[PDB]
Each structure stands twice: as C-alpha cells, then as structure tokens.
C-alpha cells in the first residue's frame, strides 16, 4: 500500500490507504516542488522525514487539530499579554521564522524543506507570524493556509512566551475574520498543552476539502502589524 513517488506524477494515493503504524505513513520519494506540496496539502497529506532519509509523506489517523477559540490561555499568560512586551507581525520575515524553527534544533527542517516552504511563502501559501522584542525577532510560527483552515508547520521561541503570543494573537486575528481550524498533524506535549485535540482522519478530510474553498478578507495575509502594545 505504501506508494513510491516519481516526477511523472504530482498525484498522491488516497489517504485511506496509509499504514496504521507508523501512523499514517503514505508514500515516499517525489520532491518538494510547489505543485506537489499544494497537491498533498489539499488532500490532507504532508512531508515529514529526518535528514538523510527519502521524502516521507503522511496522513495520520487520528489527526491533531486545534480549534482557534478553544486555544487554552493560562491566567498568568493573559496577565502577561495584557502588558505584553511584544509586538506581532504578519509575513514580515518568513525567512527568519523558518530559520528560527529549523535551527531551534528540536532539526527535521532541512535546507531542502526551508527552500521549498520559503517558495510556498513567495507564492502566497506559506505565511509566518513574527514576535518582536524591540527590534529583534524573538519568536514566531509559520504554516500553510488552506482557505479557512491553517496547517501549522512549526513555531520557535527565543524568549519566554514569544510562541504563545504569536499563536494567541494569530488565533484572535484568525477567528475574527472567518478562520475556522488549525491543523497540527500530530499531537505532541507542546501542541496538546495548547488545546490541540485529536479527531478521526475522515473528519479532518471532510473539514479540509470544506475549508479549502472558503476565504478570509482579501488583505488578510498582506504583510502587516497584528498587535502593537
């Protein structure tokens, strides 16, 4: 069932054929070209492999997900954010955010992956959220937008609470304009501590091909300031 990819087709096998263990392993090979990536993301598939290995594609079941509104914000964090020492921006520095995540060292984001996603950023599908402390980038997150659905790739923090601020502000900005869901692919300690919950793959896909044809304001992803103390 594990399909082998080639340049001959940008097509992927059905997610329902993925292996049960490792969870969701669907295919390997291919490349990280724009066409192939957008094809995979609109089918509920995504690349995830360690440096050295061939490209691995997954579509796990259950699927990790985060409902924007359901974002869990601690009492201490709100106190912190009410007097946030941070300013947040959108798509101001995608290059730096993905670097911060890849360099964070916690390093499955090889240069090949950085270049491929940076390329998506340039084509209008990969977006980043920058957290600034003064004039320095201290955190942020980035993901691929799928209409009213946002597939989170990764976030990074260099100063206490930068990540949460990014995510916090994004969620606010996101739900205020129609954003409906956040894909986390796989649940993990950090992602779960935020409100990420699991849901069957069948539902995720229903939600996916449902929110991919929706839209946010025409100027929603235009580089801009989202929160300034």
């Amino acid at each position: 069932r594990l399909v082998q990819l080639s340049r001959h087709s940008i097509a992927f096998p059905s997610p329902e054929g993925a292996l049960r263990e490792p969870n969701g392993l669907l295919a390997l090979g291919g490349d990280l070209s724009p066409a192939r990536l957008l094809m995979a993301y609109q089918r509920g598939i995504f690349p995830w492999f360690s440096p050295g290995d061939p490209i691995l594609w997954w579509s796990p079941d259950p699927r990790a997900v985060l409902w924007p509104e359901s974002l869990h914000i601690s009492r201490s964090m709100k106190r912190f954010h009410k007097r946030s020492p941070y300013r947040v921006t959108m798509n101001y520095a995608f290059g730096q955010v993905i670097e911060g995540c890849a360099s964070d060292r916690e390093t499955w984001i090889t240069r090949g992956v950085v270049e491929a996603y940076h390329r998506l950023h340039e084509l209008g599908h990969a977006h980043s959220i920058e957290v600034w402390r003064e004039d320095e980038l201290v955190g942020g997150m980035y993901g691929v937008a799928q209409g009213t659905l946002f597939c989170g790739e990764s976030m990074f923090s260099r100063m206490e609470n930068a990540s949460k601020t990014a995510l916090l502000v994004f969620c606010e900005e996101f739900i205020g304009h129609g954003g409906k869901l956040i894909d986390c692919q796989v649940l993990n300690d950090h992602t779960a501590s935020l409100g990420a919950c699991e849901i069957p793959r069948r539902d995720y896909l229903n939600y996916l091909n449902q929110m991919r044809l929706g839209r946010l304001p025409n100027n929603f992803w235009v580089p801009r300031c989202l929160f300034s103390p």
């Binding site: 995504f46 995830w48 990790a64 995540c101 916690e106 499955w108 984001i109 997150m141 993901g143 989170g152 790739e153 990764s154 976030m155 986390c184 692919q185 796989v186 993990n188 300690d189 950090h190 992602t191």
Partner: peptide, 5 residues
C-alpha cells in the same frame, strides 16, 4: 506543528 516532536 509536527516539527515540535
């Protein structure tokens, strides 16, 4: 955000 694990 799979890259966190």
């Amino acid at each position: 955000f799979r890259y966190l694990g």
